[PDB]
């Protein structure tokens, strides 16, 4: 994500997100800062392992699939997609 | 629970558990320690308690 003007308030002032966790920063401050080396990461996990997407977590998602560092700076956003990804559906794989 | 070798990694690296909260210790360290006076307690409660 680069060379843009990003308005962050329309993200957390919306309805669908049941997780908006920021780490090195407060959400109220995001519209006042300028950012460097912005990246965005996207996947689908099970419903009861959203808690593993955090600094310092154990479990087969955090240990085998996607690891966050301890000194992480950024935000973790998650929302329910039952209407879009359930029927049967089997081509969402995870490493075991 | 006594006189045995416990592999703790297959507990939290499994899928069914929706709560794995350790208190005096970290889960990553459990396979490196030896334990004293191990007991296990089991019941069924309601969903929101």
UniProtKB/Swiss-Prot annotation, chain B:
Residues 46-48 are annotated as: Integrin-binding motif. Changing residue 19 to A: In strain: Omicron/BA.2, Omicron/BA.2.12.1, Omicron/BA.4, Omicron/BA.5, Omicron/BQ.1.1, Omicron/XBB.1.5, Omicron/EG.5.1. Changing residue 16 to P: In strain: Omicron/BA.1, Omicron/BA.2, Omicron/BA.2.12.1, Omicron/BA.2.75, Omicron/BA.4, Omicron/BA.5, Omicron/BQ.1.1, Omicron/XBB.1.5, Omicron/EG.5.1. Binds to host ACE2. RBD also interacts with the N-linked glycan on 'Asn-90' of ACE2. Cleavage of S generates a polybasic C-terminal sequence on S1 that binds to host Neuropilin-1 (NRP1) and Neuropilin-2 (NRP2) receptors. Interacts with host integrin alpha-5/beta-1 (ITGA5:ITGB1) and with ACE2 in complex with integrin alpha-5/beta-1 (ITGA5:ITGB1). May interact via cytoplasmic c-terminus with M protein. May interact (via N-terminus) with host bilirubin and biliverdin, thereby preventing antibody binding to the SARS-CoV-2 spike NTD via an allosteric mechanism. Attaches the virion to the cell membrane by interacting with host receptor, initiating the infection. The major receptor is host ACE2. When S2/S2' has been cleaved, binding to the receptor triggers direct fusion at the cell membrane. When S2/S2' has not been cleaved, binding to the receptor results in internalization of the virus by endocytosis using host TFRC and GRM2 and leading to fusion of the virion membrane with the host endosomal membrane. Alternatively, may use NRP1/NRP2 and integrin as entry receptors. This is Spike protein S1.
